[PDB]
Amino acid sequence: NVRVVVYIRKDVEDNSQTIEKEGQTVTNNDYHKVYDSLKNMSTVKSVTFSSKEEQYEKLTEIMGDNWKIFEGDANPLYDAYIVEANAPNDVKTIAEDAKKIEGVSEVQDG
DSSP, X not given: OOEEEEEEOTTOOTTSSOEESSSXXXXXXXXXXXXXXHHTTSSEEEEEEEOHXXXXXXXXXXXXXXXXXXXXXXXXXXXXXXXXXXXXXXXXXXXHHHTTSTTEEEEEEO
């Protein structure tokens, strides 16, 4: 009952490596940075990094192939961080805290 999801910038590649920007791919200083921040949340139970590709498959699995219609290889969803709040009343605190973590695009409370 403490399902919290933290959306990260489009292709922030927070849980990746080497980001293509400015001058080719450059080591990502945000490597596991969001994960670590969501792990030391203190009020957190567990943190799982859900890639955008996996999120799209998961979204279609929970909904179907009649919920999306952006375009071929469209990227409406980005990286997501599944965080388990200690309590159902903490999911709100976790979301408000993750909203200030690195580049959190958005947070959705399950």
